[PDB]
Amino acid sequence: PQKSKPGVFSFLDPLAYEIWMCIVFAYIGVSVVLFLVSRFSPYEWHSSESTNEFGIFNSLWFSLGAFMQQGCDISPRSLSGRIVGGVWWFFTLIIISSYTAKLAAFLTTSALSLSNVAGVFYILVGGLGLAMLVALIEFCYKSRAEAKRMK
């Protein structure tokens, strides 16, 4: 019957949902293994500060930056951390290239309309609002702690 317009989350169409789930799982596993191989050894520490800054939060940030082809301010320096980074880089290259090719196949001339990216705009604005809320919550908690210490 009537033509179905593109979905709001239509940017996920080129890859199957199982691929997305396994991508999330691989991201989590890569971040955990990177943090483990970077921080577990007592001989990489020095009250005591680590030689590298690859904690779990920083490992997750590094993996997310690598997957998005952006990069961050830190890079692994040990052999095992560099092995993790290299395999993650190869995985990212293959997956992103496949996604771009399949997106080119799927978008089928006519210019792309805002209805095709309204979902990514919604996600962006929601993320900005969440970040603002988190920052305000942290500020309120710190101010309350300061007031409690004062009184």
The residue ranges that bind another protein (CB under 8 A) are 1-2, 5, 7-8, 18, 21-22, 25-26, 28-29, 32-33, 35-36, 39-40, 42, 45, 47-48, 56, 113-115, 118, 121-122, 125, 128-129, 132, 136
Positions in 71-130 near a copy of itself (CB under 8 A): 71-75, 77-84, 86-109, 111-114, 116-117, 120-121, 123-128, 130
Check binding of 66 to a copy of itself (CB under 8 A).
yes
- C-alpha angle 86/44/24, rounded to 5°? 40
CA-based R_g, the chain, Å: 21
C-alpha–C-alpha distance, residues 53 and 75, integer Å: 9
Check binding of 40 to a copy of itself (CB under 8 A).
yes
- Taking the complex as a whole, the smallest distance from the CB of residue 18 to another protein amounts, in Å, to 5
- C-alpha angle 96/62/51, rounded to 5°? 150
Nearest residue to 27 (alpha-carbon basis) of 72, 63, 69: 63
